[PDB]
Symmetry: D2
Subunit: 243 residues, 4 copies
């Protein structure tokens, strides 16, 4: 997370860390608890190929990575079928836990947004995670969970921004309707934050607007972070997660 | 180049090396002389952003990289406008040299194929470059130019391979018509070969069938290398390069 | 530590971690609390040059590195004067804390041996630390303190091991009287354990026999770890550390 | 080599590069041709342990590393018996080629100094090699052989310099008699240069004064580069080299 601060222990009870087996259970992406037995994340996190589930684990909200682990094995991995190698569309996936987790004040689900929520500019949102604090700059030990408020940028304005300084044709769309834009040259998510949540407060309630997906660099000028727009995949999500 | 051998001095007179300004003029991509004053290469090589020409140079056919350099500046770069970050389609670009090069038997252009050539399986083709000789294994000093014969795979068969062991839906197309597939688990191009040429011997003549673009891993099972199909972009190329 | 296991919380209350100011207070060496206000360590850890104390901190017994840090400033550093760059003899040093620490059962000093103790082969000894778990393999997160029982090898037998497969002359001494040897191809200390303690259980009491100093590789055949023999420097130590 | 320039093709005809097998014959140290069949180098280069000779090769003077290789296998490796792990004394070794090399204007031997030459301060010397051009900064391709003139620093003055900023006792010698000091914060040899030659011109003749050995950092303040003094090991060298 670029330009933020360490999150208080009571914030983001839905944040999860995904780990892969490599000398230790190493963090590679974030995710969010959207149902006691389901985790929402980015498809490219559990890609490219179909993964052996024995090499993957889920860690529920912990303030510091690795220290008080209570790894949870995964029962099923579901990746949106529109997703494919080298491409950013349909960057969304589901992880089914082998069993429901205990729900509490410190650990519980984040609400999915209603289909009509567009999360227009001005909406107060935050992205959280354990990723890098700047380009090629990893989060130092003890690995505290970080947060940062990021401004939303209307999709069309975002798409135009991504054309500033690029060879791409103005008439060629870079930012798609299933995406969402947030962040500036001071605040942003970054490598390691992928699959993590972007939440916005709407009339007192936290709603998950996006899933950390990609961006050109981190906190780079005219290059807001790009998230997968959750509302666009609610029907798909509801085909697996109980409402 | 994975699984090949050093190329004889008299072969591949159209191969070029692109250099970026670092502690020295470092090789980052390949390219090809398709006209005395024009180099064909991959859009992603001159990407992501609009490049400052002062940081780039072109090196014509040499047997070893850096040894007998005669660097050429670049007049302008033209990247296919349908090209964009994190997307592999329309991966093709043009470099105009400040001056036309002296054509010789040791250094001359490669012929582009007629729109009708499909380069079907069985065609004998070679891909050349100074890239990695295997996954995460760079070409070692003295950096000889390498070549490897690579089998062509029909687009649909190729598309089906890429769906093997992947979450992508069978109806979702991974390999597109502007693409071409070649290579196997023994022979292929790799990191650093990018933008280089795939040339096939057709009725006694060498024709450039493709530009090294991407692939999952290098020489990985059921994941042949993907090339930008040259015939698909002949009208665009001819819009800039004289006949 | 190579080949050991995580240490129980109630063991090695004298182990200390030394920290250097980087992107965080990074561990670089171990040390031991031999007096409420003094830490014993290796000269090469505080070498080669006179260190600026502002870049150094001491961390008393903790189960995991960085997690529950309570860093302590260092008042002064005293390196044995016979010590010098590229030489392994007299590798011993002292750190005076700014304040004496509160002694408890979870955190207290280790007893120094009497001048007469030779720590002969067969003695049960443990070496502890947060160093590499094998050659070029750092301790992975969450960085638990490790311990490993290491066999003692008599000085002369050790000296002869070190001449095996080496060009050094049989008459040229490699292991000196101020040294002690422990470890085998299965168990040993390694990079990062340096300055830490080798303690042996003698007649119901734990005595610090050595300070992790050097060795050829880690757990390499016929190359036991070399420690600074504590008894040899008792008069120097007592010239500074109260009784 | 720090602070120098690329060497002309006609200089240092005695410079050699030592290569170890690792994906390619990779340079790890330098050496010098002191006899048609013998190479002088540093002992720590052919250390830590007794090496399997099949993993080692010698390359005679090339302007650029790797490009026009003609690797030569080694017949025997002789390391001064006083040398041992983690210590810089007797840092000198000999490599016997399986056969004499052809001698020419471009490739030939460097003269060993007479026992009485002390190479006092003021003497014009150069150190050559393919090592790093600064700390943690490797020589970039095409890897040209570099050279640099380094000033000599009298042994005692050198030893005192190495005590500046260190915990070591003044009465404890750091720089020994079998060593020699040269360089300053602008000019010095460095990692990759080890085993290579330090030569000084004495009354028109080039003499090998030292073998690149060690130093604290590269071109660091009050830390001249340290070479093995050749004169000190002439008798040992003469037990093997005709
Ligand atoms: C030493 O010089 C002589 C004369 O210039 C060369 O012939 C040697 O080359 C070697 O011997 C010749 C006959 C031929 O076999 C060639 O391939 C050999 O390299 C040369 N010796 C060396 C090792 O360069
Ligand atoms: C769930 O909560 C109960 C009650 O506190 C506890 O006993 C049980 O172990 C918890 N399950 C997990 C997986 O922690």
């Amino acid at each position: 997370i670029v330009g933020g601060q360490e999150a208080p222990r009571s914030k983001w009870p839905w944040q999860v860390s995904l780990r892969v087996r490599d000398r230790y259970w190493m963090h590679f992406c974030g995710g969010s608890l959207i149902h006691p037995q389901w985790v929402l994340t980015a498809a490219h996190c559990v890609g490219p190929d179909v993964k052996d589930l024995a090499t993957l684990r889920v860690q529920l909200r912990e303030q510091h990575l690795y220290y008080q682990d209570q790894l949870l094995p995964v029962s099923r991995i579901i990746v949106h079928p529109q997703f494919y190698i080298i491409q950013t569309g349909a960057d969304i996936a589901l992880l089914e836990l082998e069993e429901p987790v205990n729900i509490s004040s410190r650990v519980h689900t984040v609400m999915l947004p209603p289909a009509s929520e567009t999360f227009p500019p001005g909406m107060p949102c935050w992205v959280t995670g354990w990723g890098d604090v700047d380009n090629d700059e990893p989060l130092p030990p003890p690995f505290p969970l970080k947060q940062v408020k990021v401004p939303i940028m209307e999709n069309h304005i975002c798409d135009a921004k991504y054309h500033l300084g690029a060879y791409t044709g103005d008439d060629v769309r870079i930012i798609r309707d299933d995406m969402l834009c947030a962040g500036n040259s001071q605040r942003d998510s970054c490598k390691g934050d992928s699959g993590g949540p972007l939440v916005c407060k709407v009339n007192g309630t936290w709603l998950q607007a996006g899933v950390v997906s990609w961006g050109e660099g981190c906190a780079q000028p005219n290059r807001p972070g790009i998230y997968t727009r959750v509302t666009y995949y609610l029907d798909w999500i509801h085909h697996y997660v109980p409402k």
